[PDB]
């Protein structure tokens, strides 16, 4: 059977899609199922995963690189900065990962060039909207004007992976075989161009359907049987203390400080700037779930350990839970998560979580 997982952010980004994406890749991989890891969009966000004691903040290479048997795809609907990809390939190779012979880079992706970074960095974008100024918008604007170059136009990408129009081969594997495709989305619903905060937003929308359009794969490409087995899943990742990037980046409900929360300060991957942080806003998450398509949503509550420090690093509830004060605290927070009947996981650290369902059992049962 085939499956499509799309991992998306329910707030303004940095909800831990990297962690959840890798968890999904390893779900299929550890069960011996063929699996592919695809990244879409552009390098204006890093997705953090841990493996064997190392922390990887990836902007371009799919986080499925951690699993040796996973094919890695950079979708047609991407912007690819070759200096970023070169650095990430060099980085993982220096830790013994092998990626070049299983990395597929679509030739129709936009080539994000130095001039795109320069154009954003010298513009009013950061001052006006808090942009990372990493060139993604400038590249997309050039693509719209049909003056951008494509990945297929730069032979240097062939040193890093296979530059090939793989989309129909991939669709065929889903239709005609048994492939699990994990699509790593970026940022979060509330940053979407049309989600309500414009102009304090990013240059695309950030729903599952946007990332599927970028991937060039349709959920209805799956067979009736595979859809009936719940083969199409949208993983909406949320955190209890929503963040935004530093600066003039838009409204943040209940904005507070890392110190007031008793939490270590967090910094953005692509700029190292301190994140803004606020209190949980269920209305944003409600709108995100509705926009993504509630019938296929599974909700992942990341950083439950920031709400309940006693959970840090655990993969099961601690012994004295029923008798503790913080059992009610967690239950009360869960009560006000919209659509909480779809909650499937509690994140407890950068590489740990409490799984609410017997995912491996249900795989074996199909």
Ligand X SMILES: Nc1nc2c(ncn2[C@@H]2O[C@H](COP(=O)(O)OP(=O)(O)O)[C@@H](O)[C@H]2O)c(=O)[nH]1
Binding-site residue positions for GDP: 16-19, 48, 55, 275, 303, 305, 349
Beta strands, E only, 27-179: 35-41, 47-51, 54-58, 71-81, 103-105, 110-112, 162-163
32, 220, 259, 361: which one contacts a second copy (CB under 8 A)?
220
Q: Smallest gap, in angstroms, from Cβ of residue 366 to ligand X?
A: 28
By CB under 6 A, residue 24 contacts ligand X: no
Q: Smallest gap, in angstroms, from Cβ of residue 353 to ligand X?
A: 6
Backbone phi, psi, residue 140, to 5°: -65, -40
Interacting partner of 348 out of a second copy, ligand X, none (Cβ under 5 to 8 A depending on kind):
ligand X
- CA 121, 9, 207: angle at the middle one, nearest 5? 90
By CB under 6 A, residue 190 contacts ligand X: no
By CB under 6 A, residue 77 contacts ligand X: no
34, 57, 121, 193: which one contacts a second copy (CB under 8 A)?
193
- CA 359, 362, 363: angle at the middle one, nearest 5? 85
Q: For helices 114-121 and 136-144, what crossing angle results, to 10°?
A: 110
Q: In the 8-state DSSP scheme, what is residue 273?
A: P
Cα separation values, 305 from 55, 206, 357, Å: 19, 26, 19
Catalytic positions: 14
Q: Smallest gap, in angstroms, from Cβ of residue 196 to a second copy?
A: 7
Q: Which 157-186 positions form the footprint of a second copy (CB under 8 A)?
A: 165, 168, 171
In this structure, are residues 195 and 12 in contact, taking their beta carbons and an 8 Å threshold? no
* Nearest residue to ligand X on Cβ basis: 347
Q: In the 8-state DSSP scheme, what is residue 321?
A: T
By CB under 6 A, residue 6 contacts ligand X: no
List contacts with a second copy (CB under 8 A).
Answer: 76-77, 108, 123, 125, 128-129, 137-138, 140-141, 143-147, 150, 165, 168, 171, 193-194, 196, 198-201, 203, 205, 207-210, 212-213, 216, 218-221, 223, 232, 287, 290-296
């Amino acid at each position: 059977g085939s499956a499509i997982d799309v991992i998306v952010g329910g707030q303004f980004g940095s909800e831990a899609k990297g962690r959840v994406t890798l968890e999904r890749v390893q779900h299929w991989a550890d069960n011996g199922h063929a699996v592919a890891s695809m990244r879409v969009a552009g390098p204006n966000a890093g997705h953090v995963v841990w493996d064997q004691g190392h922390r990887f903040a990836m902007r371009s290479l799919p986080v499925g690189f951690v699993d040796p048997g996973t094919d890695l795809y950079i979708a047609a609907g991407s912007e690819v900065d070759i200096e970023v990809l070169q650095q990430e390939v060099d980085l993982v190779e220096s830790y013994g990962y092998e990626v070049r012979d299983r990395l597929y880079i679509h030739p129709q992706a936009t080539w994000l060039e130095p001039v795109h970074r320069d154009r954003e960095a010298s513009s009013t974008l950061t001052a006006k909207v808090g942009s990372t100024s990493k060139g993604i918008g400038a590249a997309r604007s050039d693509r719209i004007w049909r003056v951008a170059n494509l990945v297929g136009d730069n032979p240097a990408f062939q040193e890093l992976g296979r530059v090939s129009d793989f989309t129909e081969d991939l669709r065929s594997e889903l239709v005609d075989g048994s492939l699990a495709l994990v699509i790593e989305g970026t940022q979060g619903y509330g940053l979407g161009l049309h989600a309500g905060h414009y102009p304090q937003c990013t240059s695309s929308d950030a729903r599952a359907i946007d990332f599927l359009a970028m991937a060039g794969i349709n959920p209805w490409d799956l067979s009736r049987e595979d859809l009936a087995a719940h083969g199409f899943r949208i993983h909406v990742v949320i955190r209890p203390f929503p963040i935004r990037v530093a600066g003039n980046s838009g409204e943040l409900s209940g904005e507070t400080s890392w110190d007031e929360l008793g939490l270590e300060a967090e910094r953005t991957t692509v700029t190292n700037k301190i994140r803004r942080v606020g209190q949980f806003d269920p209305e944003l998450v409600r709108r995100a779930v509705l926009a993504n398509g509630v019938n296929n949503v599974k909700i992942h509550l990341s950083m439950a350990d920031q709400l309940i420090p006693q959970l840090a690093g655990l993969e099961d509830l601690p012994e004295g839970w029923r008798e503790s004060e913080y059992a009610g605290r967690l239950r009360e927070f869960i009560d006000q998560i919209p659509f909480n009947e779809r909650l499937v996981s509690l994140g407890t650290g950068p590489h740990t979580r409490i799984e609410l369902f017997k995912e491996n059992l249900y795989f074996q049962l199909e």
